Amino acid sequence: MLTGVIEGFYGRDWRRDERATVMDWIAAAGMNTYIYGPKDDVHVRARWRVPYDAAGLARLTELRDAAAARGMVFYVSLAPCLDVTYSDPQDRAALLARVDQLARAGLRNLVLLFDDIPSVLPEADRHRFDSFAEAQADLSNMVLRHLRGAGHVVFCPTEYCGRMAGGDPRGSAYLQRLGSTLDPAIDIFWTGPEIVSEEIVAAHLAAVGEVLRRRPVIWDNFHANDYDIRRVFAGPLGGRSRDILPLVAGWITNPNNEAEANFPAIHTTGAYLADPDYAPERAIAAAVAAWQPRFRLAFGDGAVPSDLVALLCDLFWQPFALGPETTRILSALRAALTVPRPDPSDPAWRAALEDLRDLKRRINKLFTLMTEIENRDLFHTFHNYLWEAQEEVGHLVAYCDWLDEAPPPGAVFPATNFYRRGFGVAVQDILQRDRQGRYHHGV
Amino acid sequence: MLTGVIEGFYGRDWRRDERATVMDWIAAAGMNTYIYGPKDDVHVRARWRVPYDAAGLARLTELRDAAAARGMVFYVSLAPCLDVTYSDPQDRAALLARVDQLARAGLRNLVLLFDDIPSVLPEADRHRFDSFAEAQADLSNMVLRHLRGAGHVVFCPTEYCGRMAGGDPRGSAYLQRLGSTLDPAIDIFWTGPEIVSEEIVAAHLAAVGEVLRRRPVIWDNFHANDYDIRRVFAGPLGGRSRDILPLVAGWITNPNNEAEANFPAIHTTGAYLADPDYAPERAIAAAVAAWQPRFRLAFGDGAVPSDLVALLCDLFWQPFALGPETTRILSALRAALTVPRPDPSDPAWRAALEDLRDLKRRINKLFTLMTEIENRDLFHTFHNYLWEAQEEVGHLVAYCDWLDEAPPPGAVFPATNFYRRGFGVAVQDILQRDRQGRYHHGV
Numbered sequence A, B: 001m002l003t004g005v006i007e008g009f010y011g012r013d014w015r016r017d018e019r020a021t022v023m024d025w026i027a028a029a030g031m032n033t034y035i036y037g038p039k040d041d042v043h044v045r046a047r048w049r050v051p052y053d054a055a056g057l058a059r060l061t062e063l064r065d066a067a068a069a070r071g072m073v074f075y076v077s078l079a080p081c082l083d084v085t086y087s088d089p090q091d092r093a094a095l096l097a098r099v100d101q102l103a104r105a106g107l108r109n110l111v112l113l114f115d116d117i118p119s120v121l122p123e124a125d126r127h128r129f130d131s132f133a134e135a136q137a138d139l140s141n142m143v144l145r146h147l148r149g150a151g152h153v154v155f156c157p158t159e160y161c162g163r164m165a166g167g168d169p170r171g172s173a174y175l176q177r178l179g180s181t182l183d184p185a186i187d188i189f190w191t192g193p194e195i196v197s198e199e200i201v202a203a204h205l206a207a208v209g210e211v212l213r214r215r216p217v218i219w220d221n222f223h224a225n226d227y228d229i230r231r232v233f234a235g236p237l238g239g240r241s242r243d244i245l246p247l248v249a250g251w252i253t254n255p256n257n258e259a260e261a262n263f264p265a266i267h268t269t270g271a272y273l274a275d276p277d278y279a280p281e282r283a284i285a286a287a288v289a290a291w292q293p294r295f296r297l298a299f300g301d302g303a304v305p306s307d308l309v310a311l312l313c314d315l316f317w318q319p320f321a322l323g324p325e326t327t328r329i330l331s332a333l334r335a336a337l338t339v340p341r342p343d344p345s346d347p348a349w350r351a352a353l354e355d356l357r358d359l360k361r362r363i364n365k366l367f368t369l370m371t372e373i374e375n376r377d378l379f380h381t382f383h384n385y386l387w388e389a390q391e392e393v394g395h396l397v398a399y400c401d402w403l404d405e406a407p408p409p410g411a412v413f414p415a416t417n418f419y420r421r422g423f424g425v426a427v428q429d430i431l432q433r434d435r436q437g438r439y440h441h442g443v
């Protein structure tokens, strides 16, 4: 089974030391694959016809050797999809020359990406190929046949999730033609019913396997989506049962473009793949214990305490869920805010308010400690998210402190995809602002 | 400030390796004192007039040297209270000979215990001393004066908690006389308003200091009471604010007679004494992280996972509280058991029941893993408590599984100090048994 990480994002690519770090994490998680395809690298996609110069090729061979030393197979990406004429001898030759340059260097493991195509097939292709599917498969088979039995090919389809495929993937003309034309030795990426899938279920993957005529390699965007750079997810992998593993040929985690964000994603995904009894809250506890040394404070032996690293995960948990600890604190608050004016002597209101004030104290401590850690990149990764978390809990405690002083009914607080969730969203959910500018809690 | 542990319990005394282990823990917690007084040692109390033989004395000198190497001061106990004639030249001489034997050996730090006395003063004393207080103080001053400025004395009073002193400690004739007769250089132990105090508060300790005419050394029985061997507390120190520390002269933790039970007691007490921001749930998280290596599994590198060590603490938390995680799980169950027949489709009942089944799974895993650890004494310490926890959660899940199958109203489940709390008690609290033998949940 092919398992690991794809470096495929926009923005700065990873430094050599960052790539080493992430590879160590992949190896320790019991995974076995690193795929290289950064948007930073002009050769992968934007100018895919242009072979690497001598130095670039050498950078790739050294990465391979670095992954090999760790027990990992190294793949190189090629994305000849934006402006290819699939039948054109010159374009076919250009793709084969890319493949040949890599293969001769001993880079024989390739990913061919077709996720961004024109609306209509080029009329140079239309009499020879009946579809994009037929065209992409022929071009990819050509690559496979060139490698002469040494090397492996993974294909990223144009329709790579259920919504793009039209719902039921068996209903897609593209996928139907792809499954019957693409050589069986070529693997195919799949992200689930959506680009970022809340759940990936057995029945769904059975349908995918039917139409692809093979089990897919999962390309999981749960922790990161190349086209959503405003989010960080440090919680455990969730929404995928162990019972789907006999239905897949691999598991490739899409990483956050910030290297340091990815520790729990990789650690818990590793646990999911290896352990029959995987349970997300137990897995995240294990990841917090292993992650904590990276939180060493500058100029000392101490580190951010475990309880506060666990809070970091809880606050920035999953795309469709706040972490369990902060969810319960906010839910107990909602349940005491069923009345317009909470009774300050009420035990339930009092309990809910103390756990909120305590949550603010712990966020404030975590925020301050993070500014003081030795690993400055880890600090930068979480700073703005923690800044916003701090401001939001600040506003909510201020609001509830005001309700606790028992204001008159008429007084107002003095100023200064729907499955998706987060701390910021959950706070505003409770503390709303009406058309007049007035904060309230939905009476 | 005098801080650390007193080995004063009944049953087997600690082995040499056990004493070393506990001393390491005391040193790492930033504490500085070890007090030796086991019930096993016939010389301490039962036959207090009898000096040690050569070998016993040497065992004590080696313990001192062992504590010294770790940055700890070693004390020896003497309890000449059960059958002493305070005025008797022979008994005075016998006590001074004990003190002299220890002092000459370089054991100059003594605890004098008066916690178990006759109902009435001996009539040989009654004309010369007006009270037990006056008598005990004279005898203790004598010990102090014998040490000639090198050495320190701590006094355990007959009335050592507020209930024994009659409520307000300033109201006690014994304490009033003790405070004005006992040399000011002698410290005095105090356990709080009760033998095992739920809270120790500032106002209370201000009163104690008034009548004792000195700040007391706290003898805290929070985690263990020599006369309650059916209990284990692996949660954090709670119920004592940092604001009481300027009101005390010391902090001596009473340990569980099982050495391995004491890791979190000592770790969190250390944190309480050192950190202005002490918070019990954060402290217990730190203790779980430091404790976990002791849970290495036999024949391997792995250990019991952190989440399950944390569960061990949560289940066996404090004398007046179940841990927070299990408290919430049981409280959500109570709130869904407000009806005689829970509706199986009800979301609230469903959530409560799944968290209970999950709690059973995790207890079962913890129980089994504990049987497999390398440190067999750690296993023995918790085995019977975990056995009972497992049986109790077993019965409760069985009961709730039966309610989930929606039985008719009339059907019955087929068989097979009030602040105090525990997992077992909390479970029976919910799942009761009426005068006919029928289990129910208080409709």
Ligand SMILES: [Cl-]
Pocket: A304, A305, A306, A307, B285, B286, B289
């Ligand atoms: Cl810690």
Ligand SMILES: [Cl-]
Pocket: A285, A286, A289, B304, B305, B306, B307
């Ligand atoms: Cl762990």
